[PDB]
C-alpha cells in the first residue's frame, strides 16, 4: 500500500468521516487522476483505525478489472485518508434506480458478468466478502461494475444467518440476490417483508420471483445460487462461464422466464 503525501491530494467536492471526489498527483508529478477520498475524523477509536486501514490493506492485495483500484493511503498525517479510483456513476443499486428500464438485457447481463468475475477473483484469493449486495458495487462512466466496499439478513445465505458459516458458497447466495437486484433495476429484495418474514419464507423454500423481462437462463442461474444445500450451489467459476456463454450466444437470452402476473387487469 502506497503512502501518499498530502501535497498530492486535493478535495474538490463532498460525495457522502466523509467521502470526497478529488484529484491525485501521481508518477512523480507527471500524471493527475480523479479519485475518491474517504476520511477518518479525529477522535476515531483503535477499532475504527483497525477497520479503516484494514479495508485499505485488503483492497491493496487485489488487482482485477472488477475490483476497485486502491491508489494509496494517508496514514502518517491526519485526518487519515483512503484514496481509490473515482467511479463516476456511484453505487450500483442507486444507479439502476435512477436508470429504471433504460438498459438492455445484454447490458444488465454484462454488469453481472463483471461482478461475478470480481467475486471469482476474491474467492480464489481466499477472501469471503460476507456483505455482497449491489450497494457495495460501484459503477464507472463506461458501465463497468466493480466490487468496492470491503469493510443484512436478506442478502445472506441460510447457513451464514444461523451458524455464522460464511464461505464463498454463502457469497454465491448473495450474488444470486445481486442478480435479482440488477435485473429489477434495484428493487428491494423481498419487498416489504421484515427480516423475520424473509427467514420464514426462505426456510419454507420460497424464493424471489422472476424479474420482468428476465432471460429464463438468468433466472435459472439465480435460483441455483439459492440452493438450500451450499454444496449444490454453483461456484463463481461456473457463474462466470455460464454468463460468458450466454453473452456469446445472445439469442439464448431471448427465451424469457414467465413474469408472474401479481395483479389482475382485464
Ligand atoms: C469504495 C471505497 C472504499 C474505501 C475508500 C474509498 Cl475512497 C472508496 N471509494 C469510494 O467510496 C468511491 C469511489 N467512487 C465513488 N463514486 C461515487 C459515489 C457516490 C456517488 C457518486 C456520484 O457521482 N453519483 C451520481 C449521482 C447523480 C448525480 C444523482 N447522478 O445521476 C449520477 C451521475 C448517475 C450518479 C459517485 S465512491
CATH number of the domain enclosing 36? 3.30.200.20
Please tell me whether residues 75 and 107 are part of one structural domain.
Answer: no
Cell of 18: 466523509
Please tell me whether residues 46 and 162 are part of one structural domain.
Answer: no
15 is in an annotated binding site: yes
Whether ligand 1 lies within 6 angstroms of the CB of 98 is answered as yes
**Domain final residue pick, 36, 67, 87:** 87
Please tell me whether residues 228 and 191 are part of one structural domain.
Answer: yes
> Domain limits at 171?
88-266
| Strand partners for 31 | 26
The answer to whether the CB of 52 falls within 8 A of the CB of 82 is yes
18 is in an annotated binding site: yes
CA separation (Å) from 81 to 4, 24, 187, 265? 9, 12, 33, 54
Q: Which residue among 21, 37, 40, 84 is best mutated to probe the pocket of ligand 1, counting the most ligand atoms within 8 A of its Cβ?
A: 84
For 15-24, the CB contacts below 8 A with 24+ separation are 15/90, 17/41, 17/79, 21/86, 22/83, 24/71, 24/83
**Domain final residue pick, 72, 87, 102:** 87
How far is 94 from 211, CA to CA, in rounded Å? 18
Please tell me whether residues 143 and 242 are part of one structural domain.
Answer: yes
| Count of other CB atoms within 10 angstroms of residue 54 | 12
Which residue intervals of the chain are DSSP H helices? 46-60, 92-98, 105-124, 158-163, 168-183, 195-203, 216-225, 236-248
Cell of 247: 453473452
Exactly one of 131, 213, 238, 244 is catalytic; name it.
Answer: 131
How far is 193 from 187, CA to CA, in rounded Å? 13
Contacts of 122 (CB under 8 A, 6+ apart): 62, 67, 128, 129, 147, 171
How far is 19 from 11, CA to CA, in rounded Å? 9
Please tell me whether residues 3 and 112 are part of one structural domain.
Answer: no
Q: Which residue among 74, 87, 96 is best mutated to probe the pocket of ligand 1, counting the most ligand atoms within 8 A of its Cβ?
A: 87
Domain count within the chain: 2
Whether ligand 1 lies within 6 angstroms of the CB of 89 is answered as yes
Please tell me whether residues 168 and 130 are part of one structural domain.
Answer: yes
Cell of 97: 434506480
The answer to whether the CB of 40 falls within 8 A of the CB of 52 is yes
Please tell me whether residues 156 and 111 are part of one structural domain.
Answer: yes
Please tell me whether residues 1 and 116 are part of one structural domain.
Answer: no
Nearest-CA neighbor of 26 among 66, 70, 79?
A: 70
Question: Is 131 an annotated catalytic residue?
Answer: yes
Please tell me whether residues 215 and 116 are part of one structural domain.
Answer: yes
Please tell me whether residues 240 and 109 are part of one structural domain.
Answer: yes
Nearest-CA neighbor of 243 among 99, 68, 119, 64?
A: 119
19 is in an annotated binding site: yes
**Domain final residue pick, 38, 64, 87:** 87
Q: What spacing in Å lies between the alpha carbon of 57 and ligand 1's midpoint?
A: 21
Roughly what angle, to the nearest 10 degrees, separates helices 168-183 and 105-124? 160
Whether ligand 1 lies within 6 angstroms of the CB of 19 is answered as yes
Please tell me whether residues 67 and 180 are part of one structural domain.
Answer: no
Whether ligand 1 lies within 6 angstroms of the CB of 143 is answered as no
Whether ligand 1 lies within 6 angstroms of the CB of 209 is answered as no
Amino acid at each position: 500500500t502506497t503512502e501518499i503525501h498530502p501535497s498530492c491530494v486535493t478535495r474538490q467536492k463532498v460525495i457522502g468521516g466523509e467521502v470526497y471526489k478529488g484529484m491525485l498527483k501521481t508518477s512523480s508529478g507527471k500524471k493527475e487522476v480523479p479519485v475518491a477520498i474517504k476520511t477518518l475524523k479525529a477522535g476515531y477509536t483503535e477499532k475504527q483505525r483497525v477497520d479503516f486501514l484494514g479495508e485499505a490493506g485488503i483492497m491493496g492485495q487485489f488487482s482485477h478489472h472488477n475490483i476497485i483500484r486502491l491508489e494509496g493511503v494517508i496514514s502518517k498525517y491526519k485526518p487519515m485518508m483512503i484514496i481509490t479510483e473515482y467511479m463516476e456513476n456511484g453505487a450500483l443499486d442507486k444507479f439502476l434506480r435512477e436508470k429504471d428500464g433504460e438498459f438492455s438485457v445484454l447490458q444488465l447481463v454484462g454488469m453481472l458478468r463483471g461482478i461475478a468475475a470480481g467475486m471469482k477473483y476474491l474467492a480464489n484469493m481466499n477472501y469471503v466478502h460476507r456483505d455482497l449486495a449491489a450497494r457495495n458495487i460501484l459503477v464507472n462512466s463506461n458501465l463497468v461494475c466493480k466490487v468496492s466496499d470491503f469493510g443484512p439478513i436478506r442478502w445472506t445465505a441460510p447457513e451464514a444467518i444461523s451458524y455464522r458459516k460464511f464461505t464463498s458458497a454463502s457469497d454465491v447466495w448473495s450474488f444470486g440476490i445481486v442478480m435479482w437486484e440488477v435485473m429489477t433495476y434495484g428493487e428491494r429484495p423481498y419487498w416489504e417483508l421484515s427480516n423475520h418474514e424473509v427467514m420464514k419464507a426462505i426456510n419454507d423454500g420460497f424464493r424471489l420471483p422472476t424479474p420482468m423481462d428476465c432471460p429464463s437462463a438468468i433466472y435459472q442461474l439465480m435460483m441455483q445460487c439459492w440452493q438450500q444445500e451450499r454444496a449444490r450451489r454453483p461456484k463463481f467459476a461456473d457463474i462466470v462461464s455460464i454468463l460468458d456463454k450466454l453473452i456469446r450466444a445472445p439469442d439464448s437470452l431471448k427465451t424469457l422466464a414467465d413474469f408472474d402476473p401479481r395483479v389482475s387487469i382485464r
